[PDB]
């Protein structure tokens, strides 16, 4: 069991120190190498230049052909594949466009429907996709 001596603070403190590392949530935030390989660099959003347009197939029990974009981030040069809200919203994106990109929603894990894509596009050419799709604004090219 656990030692319950009055003068056992050093062993009780040192043991909890080492056993924290064995939780993967504690190691990711504290080792630092989970923020080095993060494309966002510990940020919440990131801007990038659109390279091309691609399509991603869905999972086996729910077959679909989802359409994504290949965007290269500015501040670190990494390539990420981002998701667009529908096929209708792809009309407002052309290559070599500056897009603001967020995460899809589960802190690093993919969509429950389509694998391989982890990021969603928020803005294109400094206007938002919600205002473009609802006809509130027009984008410059």
């Amino acid at each position: 069991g656990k030692c319950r001596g009055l003068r056992t603070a050093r062993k009780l403190r040192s043991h909890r120190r080492d056993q924290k590392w064995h939780d993967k949530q504690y190691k990711k935030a504290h080792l630092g190498t989970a923020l080095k390989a993060n494309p966002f660099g510990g940020a919440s959003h990131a801007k990038g230049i659109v390279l091309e347009k691609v399509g991603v197939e869905a999972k086996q029990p729910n077959s679909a052909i989802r359409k994504c974009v290949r965007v290269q981030l500015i501040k670190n040069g990494k390539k990420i594949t981002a998701f667009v809200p529908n096929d209708g919203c792809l009309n407002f994106i052309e290559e070599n466009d500056e897009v603001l990109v967020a995460g899809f929603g589960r802190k690093g894990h993919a969509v429950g429907d389509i694998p391989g894509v982890r990021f969603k596009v928020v803005k294109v050419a400094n206007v938002s996709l919600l205002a473009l799709y609802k006809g509130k604004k027009e984008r410059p090219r």
Binding site: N126, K137, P140, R141
Partner: protein, 197 residues
Amino acid sequence: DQRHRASQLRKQKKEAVLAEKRQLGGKDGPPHQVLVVPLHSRISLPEAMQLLQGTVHLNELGNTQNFMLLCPRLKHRWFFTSARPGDLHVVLDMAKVADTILFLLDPLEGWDSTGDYCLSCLFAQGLPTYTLAVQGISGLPLKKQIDTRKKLSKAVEKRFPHDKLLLLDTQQEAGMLLRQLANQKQQHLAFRDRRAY
């Protein structure tokens, strides 16, 4: 090593940017072409084109006048052109060549319906860098000049979401406008960059 590696990347990126900013408008590049487009019938374009004019070399045509401006102190060479909205082959032809568009705005409303038509044409073709100038904010009473500037920034926000409005009233503010136009990041259009024009 981490600090030295960071300063090595910063030394690379700043020399790349310094090359690109110096190559336009300087002594080793083409003139910085500015197109001045009013967006209302209440804006006196010859009054605004008077304020922008360093030494001046005034070229002119049958109807319009496009003058060359050279600033030796500020080390920047200008080519100022103007275009009334509503004549499509006038505005669209010289905006696809321009590096900067200067929009002139009504103090009271945002822009005329003709200016609304012109903006839809420029947005679809492709904008270069743009700067918004309000021409007649001093004609209004001084009490409302804070209040009417508050109302104007609402009517602009439907199309230009987060952009500062300048003033074209005096020669001082004209000098502030030239420095803003000279030192400003340039929007690189994809089409005209790949071809020689």
